[PDB]
Coordinates of N, CA and C in Angstrom, one line a residue:
Chain A
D1 N 112.4 -100.6 33.9 CA 112.6 -101.9 33.1 C 111.3 -102.8 33.2
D2 N 110.8 -102.9 34.5 CA 109.7 -103.9 34.7 C 108.4 -103.1 35.1
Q3 N 107.3 -103.4 34.4 CA 106.0 -102.7 34.8 C 105.7 -103.2 36.2
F4 N 105.9 -104.5 36.5 CA 105.2 -105.1 37.6 C 105.6 -104.4 38.9
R5 N 106.9 -104.1 39.0 CA 107.3 -103.3 40.2 C 106.9 -101.9 40.1
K6 N 106.8 -101.4 38.8 CA 106.5 -100.0 38.6 C 105.0 -99.7 39.0
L7 N 104.1 -100.5 38.7 CA 102.7 -100.3 39.2 C 102.6 -100.6 40.7
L8 N 103.5 -101.4 41.2 CA 103.6 -101.6 42.7 C 103.9 -100.3 43.3
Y9 N 104.9 -99.6 42.8 CA 105.3 -98.3 43.4 C 104.3 -97.3 43.1
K10 N 103.6 -97.4 42.0 CA 102.5 -96.4 41.7 C 101.3 -96.6 42.7
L11 N 101.0 -97.8 43.0 CA 99.9 -98.0 44.0 C 100.4 -97.7 45.4
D12 N 101.7 -97.9 45.6 CA 102.3 -97.4 46.9 C 102.1 -95.9 47.0
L13 N 102.4 -95.1 45.9 CA 102.1 -93.7 45.9 C 100.6 -93.4 46.2
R14 N 99.7 -94.1 45.5 CA 98.3 -94.1 45.9 C 98.0 -94.3 47.4
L15 N 98.6 -95.3 48.0 CA 98.4 -95.6 49.4 C 98.8 -94.4 50.3
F16 N 100.1 -93.9 50.1 CA 100.6 -92.9 51.0 C 99.9 -91.6 50.7
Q17 N 99.5 -91.2 49.5 CA 98.9 -89.9 49.2 C 97.5 -89.9 49.7
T18 N 96.7 -91.0 49.5 CA 95.4 -91.1 50.1 C 95.4 -91.1 51.6
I19 N 96.4 -91.7 52.2 CA 96.5 -91.7 53.7 C 96.8 -90.3 54.2
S20 N 97.7 -89.6 53.5 CA 98.0 -88.2 54.0 C 96.8 -87.3 53.8
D21 N 96.1 -87.4 52.7 CA 94.8 -86.7 52.5 C 93.8 -87.1 53.5
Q22 N 93.7 -88.3 53.8 CA 92.7 -88.8 54.8 C 93.0 -88.3 56.2
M23 N 94.3 -88.2 56.5 CA 94.8 -87.7 57.8 C 94.3 -86.2 57.9
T24 N 94.7 -85.4 56.9 CA 94.3 -84.0 57.0 C 92.8 -83.8 57.0
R25 N 92.1 -84.5 56.2 CA 90.7 -84.3 56.1 C 90.0 -84.8 57.4
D26 N 90.4 -85.9 57.9 CA 89.8 -86.4 59.2 C 90.1 -85.5 60.3
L27 N 91.3 -84.9 60.5 CA 91.5 -84.0 61.6 C 90.8 -82.7 61.5
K28 N 90.7 -82.2 60.3 CA 89.9 -81.0 60.0 C 88.5 -81.2 60.2
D29 N 88.0 -82.4 59.8 CA 86.6 -82.8 60.0 C 86.3 -83.0 61.5
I30 N 87.2 -83.6 62.3 CA 87.0 -83.7 63.7 C 86.8 -82.4 64.4
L31 N 87.7 -81.4 64.1 CA 87.5 -80.1 64.7 C 86.3 -79.4 64.2
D32 N 85.9 -79.5 62.9 CA 84.8 -78.9 62.3 C 83.5 -79.4 62.8
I33 N 83.4 -80.8 63.0 CA 82.2 -81.4 63.5 C 82.1 -81.1 65.0
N34 N 83.3 -80.9 65.7 CA 83.2 -80.6 67.1 C 82.7 -79.2 67.4
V35 N 82.9 -78.3 66.5 CA 82.3 -76.9 66.7 C 80.9 -76.9 66.1
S36 N 80.6 -77.7 65.0 CA 79.3 -77.7 64.4 C 78.3 -78.3 65.2
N37 N 78.7 -79.3 66.1 CA 77.7 -79.9 67.0 C 77.3 -78.9 68.0
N38 N 78.2 -78.1 68.5 CA 77.7 -77.0 69.5 C 76.8 -76.0 68.8
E39 N 77.2 -75.6 67.5 CA 76.3 -74.7 66.8 C 74.9 -75.3 66.5
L40 N 74.9 -76.6 66.2 CA 73.6 -77.3 66.0 C 72.8 -77.4 67.3
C41 N 73.5 -77.6 68.4 CA 72.9 -77.6 69.7 C 72.2 -76.3 70.0
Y42 N 72.9 -75.2 69.7 CA 72.3 -73.9 69.9 C 71.1 -73.7 69.0
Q43 N 71.2 -74.2 67.8 CA 70.0 -74.1 66.9 C 68.9 -75.0 67.4
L44 N 69.2 -76.1 68.0 CA 68.2 -77.0 68.6 C 67.5 -76.3 69.8
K45 N 68.3 -75.6 70.6 CA 67.7 -74.9 71.7 C 66.8 -73.8 71.2
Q46 N 67.1 -73.1 70.2 CA 66.3 -72.1 69.6 C 65.0 -72.7 69.1
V47 N 65.1 -73.8 68.4 CA 63.9 -74.5 67.8 C 63.0 -75.0 69.0
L48 N 63.6 -75.5 70.1 CA 62.7 -75.9 71.2 C 62.0 -74.7 71.8
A49 N 62.7 -73.6 72.0 CA 62.1 -72.4 72.5 C 60.9 -71.9 71.6
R50 N 61.1 -71.9 70.3 CA 60.1 -71.5 69.4 C 58.9 -72.5 69.4
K51 N 59.2 -73.8 69.6 CA 58.1 -74.8 69.7 C 57.3 -74.6 71.0
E52 N 58.0 -74.2 72.1 CA 57.3 -73.9 73.4 C 56.4 -72.7 73.2
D53 N 56.9 -71.7 72.6 CA 56.1 -70.5 72.4 C 54.9 -70.7 71.5
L54 N 55.1 -71.6 70.4 CA 54.1 -71.9 69.5 C 53.0 -72.8 70.2
Chain B
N1 N 57.5 -78.9 64.8 CA 57.3 -77.4 64.8 C 56.5 -77.0 63.6
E2 N 56.7 -77.6 62.4 CA 55.9 -77.3 61.3 C 54.4 -77.8 61.5
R3 N 54.3 -79.0 62.1 CA 52.9 -79.5 62.4 C 52.2 -78.6 63.3
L4 N 52.9 -78.1 64.4 CA 52.2 -77.2 65.3 C 51.9 -75.8 64.6
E5 N 52.8 -75.4 63.7 CA 52.5 -74.2 62.9 C 51.2 -74.3 62.1
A6 N 51.1 -75.5 61.5 CA 49.8 -75.8 60.7 C 48.6 -75.8 61.6
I7 N 48.8 -76.4 62.8 CA 47.7 -76.4 63.8 C 47.3 -75.0 64.2
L8 N 48.3 -74.2 64.5 CA 48.0 -72.8 64.9 C 47.4 -72.0 63.8
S9 N 47.8 -72.2 62.6 CA 47.2 -71.5 61.4 C 45.7 -71.9 61.3
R10 N 45.4 -73.2 61.4 CA 44.0 -73.7 61.4 C 43.2 -73.1 62.5
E11 N 43.7 -73.0 63.7 CA 43.0 -72.5 64.9 C 42.8 -71.0 64.7
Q12 N 43.8 -70.2 64.2 CA 43.6 -68.8 64.0 C 42.6 -68.5 62.9
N13 N 42.6 -69.4 61.8 CA 41.6 -69.2 60.8 C 40.2 -69.5 61.3
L14 N 40.0 -70.5 62.2 CA 38.8 -70.7 62.9 C 38.3 -69.6 63.8
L15 N 39.3 -69.0 64.5 CA 39.0 -67.9 65.4 C 38.5 -66.6 64.6
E16 N 39.2 -66.3 63.5 CA 38.8 -65.2 62.6 C 37.4 -65.5 62.0
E17 N 37.2 -66.7 61.6 CA 35.9 -67.0 61.0 C 34.8 -66.9 62.1
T18 N 35.0 -67.4 63.3 CA 34.0 -67.3 64.4 C 33.7 -65.9 64.8
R19 N 34.8 -65.0 64.9 CA 34.6 -63.6 65.2 C 33.8 -62.9 64.1
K20 N 34.2 -63.2 62.9 CA 33.5 -62.6 61.7 C 32.0 -63.0 61.7
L21 N 31.7 -64.3 62.0 CA 30.4 -64.8 62.1 C 29.6 -64.1 63.2
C22 N 30.2 -63.9 64.4 CA 29.6 -63.2 65.5 C 29.2 -61.8 65.2
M23 N 30.2 -61.0 64.6 CA 29.9 -59.7 64.2 C 28.9 -59.6 63.1
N24 N 28.9 -60.5 62.1 CA 27.9 -60.5 61.1 C 26.5 -60.8 61.6
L25 N 26.4 -61.7 62.6 CA 25.2 -62.0 63.2 C 24.6 -60.8 64.0
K26 N 25.5 -60.1 64.7 CA 25.0 -58.9 65.5 C 24.5 -57.9 64.5
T27 N 25.2 -57.5 63.5 CA 24.8 -56.5 62.5 C 23.5 -57.0 61.8
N28 N 23.5 -58.3 61.4 CA 22.3 -58.8 60.7 C 21.0 -58.8 61.6
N29 N 21.2 -59.0 62.9 CA 20.0 -58.9 63.8 C 19.6 -57.5 64.0
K30 N 20.6 -56.6 64.1 CA 20.2 -55.2 64.2 C 19.5 -54.7 62.9
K31 N 20.0 -55.1 61.7 CA 19.4 -54.7 60.5 C 18.0 -55.3 60.3
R32 N 17.9 -56.6 60.8 CA 16.6 -57.2 60.6 C 15.5 -56.6 61.6
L33 N 15.9 -56.2 62.7 CA 15.0 -55.4 63.6 C 14.7 -54.1 63.0
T34 N 15.6 -53.4 62.4 CA 15.4 -52.1 61.8 C 14.6 -52.1 60.5
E35 N 14.7 -53.1 59.7 CA 14.2 -53.0 58.3 C 13.0 -53.9 58.0
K36 N 12.6 -54.8 59.0 CA 11.6 -55.8 58.6 C 10.3 -55.7 59.4
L37 N 10.4 -55.7 60.8 CA 9.2 -55.7 61.6 C 8.9 -54.5 62.4
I38 N 9.7 -53.4 62.3 CA 9.4 -52.2 63.0 C 8.6 -51.2 62.1
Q39 N 8.5 -51.6 60.9 CA 7.8 -50.7 59.9 C 6.3 -50.8 60.1
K40 N 5.6 -50.1 59.2 CA 4.1 -50.0 59.3 C 3.4 -51.4 59.1
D41 N 4.1 -52.4 58.5 CA 3.5 -53.7 58.3 C 3.4 -54.5 59.5
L42 N 3.9 -54.1 60.7 CA 3.8 -54.8 61.9 C 2.3 -54.9 62.3
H43 N 1.9 -56.1 62.7 CA 0.5 -56.3 63.1 C 0.3 -55.6 64.4
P44 N -0.9 -54.9 64.6 CA -1.1 -54.1 65.8 C -1.2 -55.0 67.1
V45 N -1.4 -56.3 67.1 CA -1.4 -57.1 68.3 C 0.0 -57.4 68.7
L46 N 1.0 -57.3 67.8 CA 2.4 -57.4 68.2 C 3.0 -56.1 68.7
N47 N 2.2 -55.0 68.7 CA 2.7 -53.8 69.2 C 3.1 -53.8 70.7
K48 N 2.4 -54.6 71.4 CA 2.7 -54.8 72.9 C 3.8 -55.7 73.1
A49 N 4.0 -56.7 72.3 CA 5.2 -57.6 72.4 C 6.5 -56.8 72.1
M50 N 6.4 -55.9 71.1 CA 7.6 -55.1 70.8 C 7.9 -54.1 72.0
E51 N 6.9 -53.7 72.7 CA 7.0 -52.7 73.7 C 7.9 -53.2 74.9

């Protein structure tokens, strides 16, 4: 019947769905960056060894 | 690492150029001894310097 509460509930749907997506993306990103930092550290060690040989 | 790669490339180019120059100078000196002053055109007073 009323738009005003209707778009209120629509932006509520926006809030909860973006929060759920942000939760999943942030946790997966935490794990992914936690392993990618170790991989990049191994790459940095390889680069340092190549620099010493060079 | 890229900067040191460029430095090594320049140094290796200089080393190859210097070694090529040294070998070219050695062969050029040998050829100049063989083809210029050991022939019959050598002045007889330089025959003892050559000896």
